[PDB]
Structures are given as C-alpha cells and as structure tokens.
C-alpha cells in the first residue's frame, strides 16, 4: 500500500555517528529522564506534565576576572521535552547516551471533607480557622 522498496531492519537506529557528538560526550555523559517536581513554593501544577531529559552536571569553576561561572561541557544547560517517556527513551538510545529512568510520581488522591474540621469524638476536629 506504500511500496517504496521496504526492508526489514531489526537492529535499532545508530544515528550516533550522524549526530556529530564527540566521542566522550556520547560515551561518558549520562542523561536521566524525569517529570520535574513542582516548586513547593507554588501550588501550580502544569509543570509536572511533561518528560524532561537532562544531563549530569560537570565542572563549574570561577574565572579569574569576576568569578563568573565558566564551564566546559556544552551539554549542560540542555534539557529536552517529551510527551511520553517512551519517546524520550527511544531518543536516548537512538542517540546513544547512557540513560536513567525515573517513574512519573503523581499525588495520591486523598479523601478530603470540610465536615472533618468539626467532630463529636474524632481527633480531626480543628481548633481555629
């Protein structure tokens, strides 16, 4: 139905040599994927709804001039977004970075009722509003 001289190719993609990443950056660097935990200073939620990948932090020395934050690894302030973790891990393997996986932690739904603020015998009765 889509005849274009199709060929079964079982082994996974090795686009590594195509990407141009240097050997030690494609080998030594370890990237982890995760859902970023929300800033506890905020109650907003729509920042833990994506799968972001980031790389291990490297040396950060202070230059002699003003004590700036000169670094050497270019892939330090590089974070990639992904809808589902499967896409992220596929990208990681096909690129060739050693990857680490953390499962999407989500808040457990707790039973909440205002009638618990008052009680006849339960300890849950509040003492101030």
Partner 1 sequence: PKKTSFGSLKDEDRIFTNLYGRHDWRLKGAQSRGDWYKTKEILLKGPDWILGEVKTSGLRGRGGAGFPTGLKWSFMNKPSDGRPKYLVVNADEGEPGTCKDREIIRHDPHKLVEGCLVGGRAMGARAAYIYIRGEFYNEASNLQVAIREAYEAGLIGKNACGSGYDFDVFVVRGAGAYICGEETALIESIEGKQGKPRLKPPFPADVGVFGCPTTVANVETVAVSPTICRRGGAWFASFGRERNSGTKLFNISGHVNHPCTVEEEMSVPLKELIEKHAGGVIGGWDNLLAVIPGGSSTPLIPKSVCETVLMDFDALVQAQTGLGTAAVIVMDRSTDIVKAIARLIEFYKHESCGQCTPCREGVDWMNKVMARFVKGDARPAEIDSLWEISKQIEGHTICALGDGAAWPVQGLIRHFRPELEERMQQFALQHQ
Partner 2 sequence: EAIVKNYPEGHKAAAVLPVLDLAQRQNGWLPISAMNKVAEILQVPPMRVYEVATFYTMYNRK
- Backbone φ, ψ for residue 95 (5° rounding): -75, -35
Closer to partner 2 at the Cβ: 108 or 129? 129
44 is a contact residue toward partner 1 (CB under 8 A): no
**Shorter beta-carbon distance to partner 2: residue 114 or 120:** 120
- 66 vs 126, which CB is nearer to partner 2? 126
Q: Give the span between the Cα atoms of 20 and 5, in whole angstroms.
A: 29
d(CA 38, CA 124): 28
- Which x/- pattern over 87-126 shows residues binding partner 2 (rule: CB under 8 A)? ---------------------------------xx-----
CA 21, 30, 75, 27: dihedral to nearest 10 degrees? Answer: -20
Compute the residue count for the chain.
129
Query: Which residues are at the interface with partner 2 (CB under 8 A)?
Result: 120-121, 127-128
């Amino acid at each position: 139905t889509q005849d274009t001289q199709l060929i079964a190719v079982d082994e996974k993609l090795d686009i590594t040599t195509l990407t141009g990443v240097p050997e030690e950056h494609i080998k030594t660097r370890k990237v982890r994927i995760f859902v970023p935990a929300r800033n506890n200073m905020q109650s907003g939620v729509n920042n833990t709804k994506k799968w972001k990948m980031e790389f291990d932090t490297r040396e950060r020395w202070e230059n002699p001039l003003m004590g700036w934050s000169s670094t050497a690894d270019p892939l330090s302030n590089l974070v990639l977004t992904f809808s589902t973790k499967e896409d992220a891990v596929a990208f990681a393997e096909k690129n060739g970075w050693s990857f680490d996986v953390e499962e999407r932690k989500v808040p457990k739904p707790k039973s909440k009722s205002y009638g618990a603020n008052f009680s006849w015998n339960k300890r849950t009765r509040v003492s101030t509003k």
